[PDB]
Amino acid sequence: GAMGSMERASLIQKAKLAEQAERYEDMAAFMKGAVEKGEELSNEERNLLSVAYKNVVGGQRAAWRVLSSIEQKSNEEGSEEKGPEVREYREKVETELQGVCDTVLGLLDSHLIKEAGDAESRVFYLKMKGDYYRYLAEVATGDDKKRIIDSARSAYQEAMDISKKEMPPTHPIRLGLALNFSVFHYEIANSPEEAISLAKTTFDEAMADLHTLSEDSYKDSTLIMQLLRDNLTLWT
Amino acid sequence: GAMGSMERASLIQKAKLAEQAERYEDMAAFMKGAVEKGEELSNEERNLLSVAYKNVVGGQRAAWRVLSSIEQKSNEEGSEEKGPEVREYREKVETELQGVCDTVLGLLDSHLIKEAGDAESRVFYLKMKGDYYRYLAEVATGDDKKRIIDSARSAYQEAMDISKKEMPPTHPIRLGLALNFSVFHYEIANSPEEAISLAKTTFDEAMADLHTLSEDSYKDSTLIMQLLRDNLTLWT
Amino acid sequence: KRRKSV
Amino acid sequence: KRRKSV
Ligand SMILES: [Cl-]
Ligand SMILES: [Cl-]
Ligand SMILES: [Mg+2]
Ligand SMILES: [Mg+2]
Ligand SMILES: [Mg+2]
Ligand SMILES: [Mg+2]
Ligand SMILES: [Mg+2]
Ligand SMILES: [Mg+2]
């Protein structure tokens, strides 16, 4: 693509510089170029990829929600007609969001997932797949909303099944995946009980495994377990 | 341009929504489209314009400085050769920064400044002109650095001369202009004394005029006077 | 306040 | 800490 002429290593290096510069769109494009080199990503690179897009899409999601709330307010009784702009601009932000999600999903489908044989990679990419369908679900309102949700669900489920089989319950990817899948349940699938059961069980199974960990692994896991607890506290 | 088909009012409305969504690139493009409608900007619109670009360019400047420092570190004795990437990517960010600054300067030159007859508009745009040449100066290293600086200086000076003639010393635009011109002196023109004299005099002349102000004007001015003082405290 | 995802 | 401009 645009990054076709840059060395894979240089893209990765630049992705890391963009991350330092908080230039996440650039980071994302560098990482996309790196993915598109066709080589599997190392753990670090997969996290670079994830960080880049999460940040890009997180800005678009936060924007979309701002615009969505504005738009919902203009749709209330007594709201003064302001014309199409709010909807137009929400749609613009939404479209751009969908296109980032489509791009990530496209990187996962071509060909990250199919080449990812290790649990850490495969779960990670499936989680990412769940996450980006989830972001699509967040803005979905059409005939495809159920299928988008189902795709998020199916990706998360396959990631959960592998993570459960192949990773310790404290594995940060397993924990992050469960955290997000729990959020998917709560806020996308209208299954707050499942969301809560998932976060509870995940937290408790991780708790029971902490003893196996070095101090640094302990810190990685407990960091994520705390996010599970924050949700549980929020949700209960 | 891209915004040629959108109503001026809709661009302004969208600029305001983008601002709410913190989507400053979008805000900036909307405001650029609005400027390019050819009509003068109202005070609010000029501030929308300024806010949009300041934020865009402020992200690029912060990025550039991150990358610049990295690059300077790779240029120190004992630094491990990392190849061209840091410089390349600094240059990419720098180029994009220059292009934003060129775009703003281009909006000012075509045709904001020449149509801006009121002090509040004309000073404001000249300040903006000084600011965007200043941002260009910040990254300038070539044969044009002196001329870029001179352009910043000349714009600020014309803005200062008008502001001094036409605005009260507490006018927030006069204060902001003096604040930036003082920063220009300190950090671009290597004239920290002038920077300090300017911020001192500006602060003190504004102080002596506060008594004329309503509470809300007082708050606007003192807000800026505090930035002058913060610089003075920083610089002395 | 916003639920966490990672 | 960073000088102010506006
Ligand atoms: Cl739009
Ligand atoms: Cl580059
Ligand atoms: Mg190669
Ligand atoms: Mg009404
Ligand atoms: Mg229940
Ligand atoms: Mg019209
Ligand atoms: Mg060495
Ligand atoms: Mg002295």
Q: How deeply is B184 buried, as exposed, middle or buried, from its count of CB atoms within 10 A (0-12, 13-18, 19+)?
A: buried
Cβ burial of B190 (10 Å; 0-12, 13-18, 19+) is: exposed
CB of A230 less than 8 A from some CB of C: yes
Separation CA A44–CA A42 (nearest Å):
5
Measured CA angle at A101 (ends B63, A230), to 5 deg = 80
Burial (CB count within 10 angstroms: exposed 0-12, middle 13-18, buried 19+), residue B195: buried
What experiment produced this structure?
Answer: X-ray
Cβ(B122)–Cβ(B113) under 8 Å? yes
Local structure of A171: helix, strand or coil:
coil
| Interacting residues of B209 by C-beta distance below 8 A, sequence separation 6+ | B168, B169, B170, B221
CA-based end-to-end distance of chain A? 47
**Contacts of B17 by beta carbon, 8 Å cutoff, 6+ apart:** A67, A70, A85, A86, A89
Q: At what angle do helices A119-139 and A172-183 cross, to 10 degrees?
A: 20
DSSP state for residue B117 in the 8-state scheme: -
Q: A187 vs C3: CB contact, 8 Å cut-off?
A: yes
- Cis omega (within 30 of 0) on the bond before A171? no
Cβ-Cβ contacts under 8 Å, A59 against chain B: 22-23
Amino acid symbol at A211? H
CATH architecture observed for domain A1-236 = Up-down Bundle (1.20)
Angle, helices B8-20 vs A43-74, to 10°: value is: 120
> In 3D, which of B193, B201, B132, B189 has the Cα closest to residue B160?
B201
Could you tell me which of A181, A183, A178, A156 has the C-alpha nearest to residue A225? A178
What is the C-alpha separation between B24 and B35, in angstroms, rounded? 16
Residue A190 gets which letter from DSSP? S
Question: Which chain D positions have a beta carbon within 8 Å of B227's beta carbon?
Answer: 4-6
List of chains touching B (3+ CB pairs within 8 A): A, D
Biggest CA–CA distance in chain D, Å, is: 15
A85 shares contact with chain B (CB less than 8 Å) = yes
- Three-class SS state of A4: coil
What one-character DSSP code corresponds to residue A165? H
Q: What's the rounded Cα separation, in Å, for the pair B187 and B193?
A: 11
Count of other CB atoms within 10 angstroms of residue B77: 4
CB B173 within 8 A of CB B163: yes
Q: What share of chain A is helix, strand, coil (3-state, %, to 5)?
A: 80, 0, 20
Please tell me what DSSP assigns to residue A167: S
- A90 Cα: distance to centroid of ligand 6 (angstroms): 22
CA atoms within 13 A on the CB side of A56: 29
Residues of D within 8 A of B234 (CB-CB) are: 1, 3
Nearest to A12 by CA among A127, A1, A53, A37: A37
The vertex-B14 CA angle with B11 and B19, nearest 5°, equals 125
Quote the tokens at residue B127.
Answer: 């300040």
Structure tokens given for A95: 């479209």
H helices, E strands: number in chain D:
0, 0
Whether the upstream peptide bond of residue A111 has omega within 30° of 0, thus cis, is yes
DSSP state of B118: S
Residue spans of alpha helices (H) in B75-118: 85-107, 113-115
Helix axes A85-107, A119-139, angle to 10 degrees: 160
Asked if A156 and A177 touch (Cβ cutoff 8 Å), the reply is yes
| Residue of chain C with shortest Cα separation from A134 | C5
Q: What CA–CA distance (Å, rounded) separates A41 from B127?
A: 48
Closest CA to B66 of D4, A33, A54, A14: A14
Alpha helix (H) residue ranges in A21-109: 24-36, 43-74, 85-107
As a whole number of angstroms, the distance between CA B176 and CA B94 comes to 25
Query: Residue A21 and residue B62: Cβ atoms within 8 Å?
Result: yes
Q: Domains of chain B: which residue ranges? A: 1-236
Cβ pair B197, B157 in contact under 8 A: no
**ω into B171 cis (within 30 of 0):** no
Resolution of the structure, angstroms: 2.0
**Among B38, B66, B36, B32, which residue's Cα sits nearest to residue B52?**
B32
Q: Are A19 and A48 within 8 A, CB to CB?
A: yes
What ligand has the least distance to the C-alpha of A235? 5
Rounded distance between C-alpha atoms, residue B58 and residue A136, angstroms: 30
DSSP code of B210?
G
Tokens of A142: 């059409």
